[PDB]
Amino acid sequence: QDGFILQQVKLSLDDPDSYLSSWNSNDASPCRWSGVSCAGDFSSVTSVDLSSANLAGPFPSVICRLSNLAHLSLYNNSINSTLPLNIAACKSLQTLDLSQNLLTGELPQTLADIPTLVHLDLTGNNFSGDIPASFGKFENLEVLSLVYNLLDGTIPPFLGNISTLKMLNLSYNPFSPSRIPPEFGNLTNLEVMWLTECHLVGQIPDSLGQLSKLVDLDLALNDLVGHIPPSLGGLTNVVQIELYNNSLTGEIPPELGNLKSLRLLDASMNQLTGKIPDELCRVPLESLNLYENNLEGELPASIALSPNLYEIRIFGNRLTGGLPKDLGLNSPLRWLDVSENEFSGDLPADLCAKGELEELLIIHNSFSGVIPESLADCRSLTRIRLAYNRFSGSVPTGFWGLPHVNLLELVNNSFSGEISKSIGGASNLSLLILSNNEFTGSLPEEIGSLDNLNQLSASGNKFSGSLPDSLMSLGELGTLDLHGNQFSGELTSGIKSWKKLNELNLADNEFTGKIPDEIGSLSVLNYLDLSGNMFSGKIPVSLQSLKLNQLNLSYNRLSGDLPPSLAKDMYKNSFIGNPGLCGDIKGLC
Ligand SMILES: *[C@@H]1O[C@H](CO[C@@H]2O[C@@H](C)[C@@H](O)[C@@H](O)[C@@H]2O)[C@@H](O[C@@H]2O[C@H](CO)[C@@H](O)[C@H](O)[C@H]2NC(C)=O)[C@H](O[C@@H]2O[C@@H](C)[C@@H](O)[C@@H](O)[C@@H]2O)[C@H]1NC(C)=O
Ligand SMILES: *[C@@H]1O[C@H](CO)[C@@H](O[C@@H]2O[C@H](CO)[C@@H](O[C@@H]3O[C@H](CO)[C@@H](O)[C@H](O)[C@@H]3O)[C@H](O)[C@H]2NC(C)=O)[C@H](O)[C@H]1NC(C)=O
Ligand SMILES: *[C@@H]1O[C@H](CO)[C@@H](O[C@@H]2O[C@H](CO)[C@@H](O)[C@H](O)[C@H]2NC(C)=O)[C@H](O[C@@H]2O[C@@H](C)[C@@H](O)[C@@H](O)[C@@H]2O)[C@H]1NC(C)=O
Ligand SMILES: *[C@@H]1O[C@H](CO)[C@@H](O[C@@H]2O[C@H](CO)[C@@H](O)[C@H](O)[C@H]2NC(C)=O)[C@H](O)[C@H]1NC(C)=O
Ligand SMILES: *[C@@H]1O[C@H](CO)[C@@H](O[C@@H]2O[C@H](CO)[C@@H](O)[C@H](O)[C@H]2NC(C)=O)[C@H](O)[C@H]1NC(C)=O
Ligand SMILES: *[C@@H]1O[C@H](CO)[C@@H](O[C@@H]2O[C@H](CO)[C@@H](O)[C@H](O)[C@H]2NC(C)=O)[C@H](O)[C@H]1NC(C)=O
Ligand SMILES: *[C@@H]1O[C@H](CO)[C@@H](O[C@@H]2O[C@H](CO)[C@@H](O)[C@H](O)[C@H]2NC(C)=O)[C@H](O)[C@H]1NC(C)=O
Ligand SMILES: *[C@@H]1O[C@H](CO)[C@@H](O)[C@H](O)[C@H]1NC(C)=O
Ligand SMILES: *[C@@H]1O[C@H](CO)[C@@H](O)[C@H](O)[C@H]1NC(C)=O
Ligand SMILES: *[C@@H]1O[C@H](CO)[C@@H](O)[C@H](O)[C@H]1NC(C)=O
């Protein structure tokens, strides 16, 4: 009969990829059929897995006529229409996975009438309306997943009545704004509470502290208010706490230090105040994210003790004092973001000791001293932002040439010395921002070797000498800003090679000679500033062809007529401070 029933399933579904080709009526048994598994001396179908088969059409309710069917998966198909109340006919089902389908309408209340059901996954469907009251009466359910549906009812307290529940997954539903039922604290066996983006309102219940077996608490992306409960110290087995993007206030409880198994804490994007507790930092955390809060005081040195720490993101706070001296020495630190704080003192000497540091983001702080010499050997680095600090000294030779660095931002510091020839080694460099420093010397020829470079901003420095001829080799360059320097010499026909250049700013330098006619060849140039230089001769006629939002050729030695487009009252400020250009425009001189 199992074969005949499965033939009825086949006739009820669209099978464009012929996944059910093997479903042959002439077969003695259906056990060898695609997606079918049998058990017992009877060769009874016990499992059907038609996942990722590109099957389409309504749920095949006739499949429930299989007496011994214990596992059904139609995961990742185009199963559509409503889930029938006839699903209760599947009385032997232990696991049901209908995730990633096109199922619509209300959840059938008869799902709770399957006593054997342990796993229910309806994730990634279009189910809407209230969660049925029957769902409170599930006999043996351990996993309930309704993630990414259109459920628009309130979160029901009766879900707390499922004593056997180990995972409650209701994340990513447009639920009517609802408080977390305190009855959820009575789910003694619960290991996962996943309520991300569930339109939660009100305060986290103290009852949630009763969940001794909880491994993951996720209440992120909601409108939760009030304080993180000190009762959460009762979460003995918790490893992950996600409270990010809420409206939580008050201080981080020191009782979080009692959570020995805690490795991941993210309470970022809240209104938390007070200091980060030493007790929490004593826990050997893997990730601590407390960014975009109103936290103050020092970062406890105990955080450096963790052997598992790879991530610290505490940016956008009012934290003071120095970073821990041993930070990175005992941990595989990968991501460090302490930006927009009040941190001071030298950077820790061994941030990259374990050789895994990828992101060093410390902008808008009062960090001082020289870049640690160890960081010159940190080849793992991909993004470096030391901008808006009080750093001094030369940038270490190795630091310039780090191979995987895509962004090097040293803007607004007191950095001195020269860009080393080692910069040629920076194959991955796309953005180089060194503006507002005391850098000296000439740009190295090795800068031209950086084919991937898109931005070179080094304004407000003491750079000098002729631009390297290799600078033409920067075909991918979109921004070149060298204003407020002592750069000398002349531009060449090589500037034509800057095909993708949108901005050229060489203002307030000592440049001499004619502006090359090849300036017109730069099709996407929208910003040109050559002001405060000694550029001489006629303005290139080709400049008319360029569409420029900003043009400044002021305070130069330029002479002769303007192209007709540029000869306008609006462009007077662009050509002031040039004796030769006088009388090109009425009221210029
Ligand atoms: C439920 O899915 C049925 C199977 O269709 C295929 O899979 C869909 C997910 C979609 O990719 C579709 O393009 C596939 O053809 C639909 O049936 C059919 O509808 C299509 C037009 O969309 C038609 O060309 C087919 O001949 C027709 N086949 C069968 C066996 O009915 C259901 O569609 C609905 O009913 C149709 C008769 C038609 O009136 C259509 O407008 C309806 O949407 C799908 N039902 C729902 C509720 O979406
Ligand atoms: C109910 O929700 C929980 C929490 O989202 C789901 O649990 C978790 O499942 C994911 C995906 O399987 C796990 O992620 C990964 O880690 C493993 C290594 O252990 C790795 O191989 C994967 O590539 C992935 O990175 C996650 O660790 C796990 N978390 C917990 C706390 O258990 C659960 O699957 C959901 N159940 C249903 C039916 O929706
Ligand atoms: C979790 O289950 C407990 C046991 O059923 C609840 O406690 C009890 O409360 C009942 C009324 O809600 C009462 O009839 C029971 O006699 C009592 N049982 C025991 C052993 O205490 C508990 O409810 C809460 O705690 C009690 C003391 C009251 O303060 C109630 O207002 C609470 O809701 C359940 N917890 C939750 C959060 O529902
Ligand atoms: C969901 O099922 C579909 C259909 O089996 C999977 O789609 C295909 O992806 C594989 C691997 O990239 C390709 O070789 C096939 O050509 C694709 N087929 C179709 C019809 O798109 C899809 O990968 C599955 N998704 C998941 C997350 O498992
Ligand atoms: C809470 O859960 C219990 C246990 O699943 C539910 O209890 C039963 O109620 C159903 C239908 O009313 C009966 O068929 C069962 O025989 C009852 N079993 C037991 C062990 O009492 C109870 O209804 C649920 N309550 C809520 C509000 O959902
Ligand atoms: C970044 O550095 C620049 C240059 O030092 C700062 O800009 C100027 O502000 C100072 C006063 O603090 C003036 O005396 C200068 O004339 C300004 N220079 C220029 C070129 O505009 C800028 O304020 C700094 N930004 C931050 C956030 O610290
Ligand atoms: C081109 O650059 C010159 C020099 O920086 C600019 O000149 C001055 O204009 C500003 C704003 O009106 C005044 O505050 C300064 O006093 C002027 N300085 C001098 C030395 O004259 C000019 O405005 C810029 N023009 C454009 C179009 O950007
Ligand atoms: C499911 O809901 C989404 C979002 O409202 C919509 O874009 C999609 O077309 C819906 N699909 C079905 C089958 O109702
Ligand atoms: C945080 O939530 C707000 C809505 O309150 C949303 O606009 C924003 O994109 C979210 N940001 C992150 C990083 O989750
Ligand atoms: C370049 O840096 C980016 C991150 O900015 C990274 O994803 C990429 O893998 C790097 N590529 C190389 C070749 O280092």
Author numbering: 18 to 606
Paper text:
Here we demonstrate that HSL1 binds IDA/IDL peptides with high, and CLE peptides with lower affinity, respectively. Ligand sensing capability and receptor activation of HSL1 require a SERK co-receptor kinase. Crystal structures with IDA/IDLs or with CLE9 reveal that HSL1-SERK1 complex recognizes the entire IDA/IDL signaling peptide, while only parts of CLE9 are bound to the receptor. Our work reveals that HSL1 is a receptor for IDA/IDL signaling peptides.
To characterize the sequence-related HSL1 receptor, we determined the crystal structure of the apo HSL1 ectodomain at 1.83 Å resolution. HSL1 folds into a superhelical assembly of 21 LRRs with a conserved ligand-binding surface, suggesting a shared peptide recognition mechanism with the receptors HAE/HSL2. To quantify these interactions, we titrated IDA and IDL peptides into a solution containing isolated HSL1 ectodomain, using isothermal titration calorimetry (ITC). In contrast, we did not detect binding of CLE9 to the isolated ectodomain of HSL1 in ITC assays. Structural superimposition of the CLE-receptor PXY25 and HSL1 highlights that HAE-type and CLE-sensing receptors have evolved different peptide-binding surfaces in their LRR domain: HSL1 features a set of bulky amino acids in the N-terminal part of the binding surface, incompatible with specific CLE peptide perception.
